[PDB]
Amino acid sequence: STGSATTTPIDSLDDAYITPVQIGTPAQTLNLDFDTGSSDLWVFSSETTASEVDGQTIYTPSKSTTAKLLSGATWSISYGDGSSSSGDVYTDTVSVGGLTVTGQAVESAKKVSSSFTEDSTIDGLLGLAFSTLNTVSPTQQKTFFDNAKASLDSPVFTADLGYHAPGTYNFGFIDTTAYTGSITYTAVSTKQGFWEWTSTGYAVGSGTFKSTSIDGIADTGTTLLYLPATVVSAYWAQVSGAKSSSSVGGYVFPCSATLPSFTFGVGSARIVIPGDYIDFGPISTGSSSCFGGIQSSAGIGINIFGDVALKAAFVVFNGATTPTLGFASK
């Protein structure tokens, strides 16, 4: 089996991308943020406290003939931004882009934090990291990818995120029309449960490539590219109005700048992020200051190749017994 689904940015900044997923019987369509940085599939539901629901589409398990309560099981998760949710757990059929999994654990939110209530476009998250990070207790549940792998034509799923434009998430096949050249694969470490890999270096603009090892994670659910402080300082040093701003929380620069590109290594290959993708957006509508798309990871603790980097490439999450991460230009 395979599936293929359109993923669309939630706003004109590409802050995040949603992908419709059909849950239950008959199917209830919810738009989820596919998150390779976590391993829970959770949704707003008929169980979520009413005052914490502000525009989202809820799953109602009592209307699904295939839903089953997983007795005794509860979950609680917090994310890097401080947001959180918790609740209980059903299994149900879940389909993405025509690929159906039966008995997928669907985590039903009894409570969600303020940031999720204010995000009207995101109905829940679909976690695609390794199932060791899943937060269901007492027994952890597999992600939708792990449950699909027995039926997939190939144990793989690709992310092709667009720049201010829709993209695609494919499961089970590699679309050779979707990228140019060849894919370079690199080793993944699953010791922390993440799609964790080591970039071989970087260059800014038309400058020299510096070989230096950058361990980071590929996270579709983080917007920006967070790199070590001295690498990010080398980048902004090439942009004449750029400065670090404590008030806004990162490097800002005049919107009227043309920004250099940023290249990162994958083994012997090079991925180039166009300058325009790094120009994330004005800090306020009508501002002449813009927020940059590469920021320091020092405060985070880990380096994160978020959507600004992944949307410059076609990325293959190879979930064979020894996983790997493939990157091609597109």
Binding site: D33, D81, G221, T222, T223
Partner: peptide, 7 residues
């Protein structure tokens, strides 16, 4: 309005 998704 960037997002930063487990901790």
């Amino acid at each position: 309005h960037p997002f930063h998704x487990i901790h």
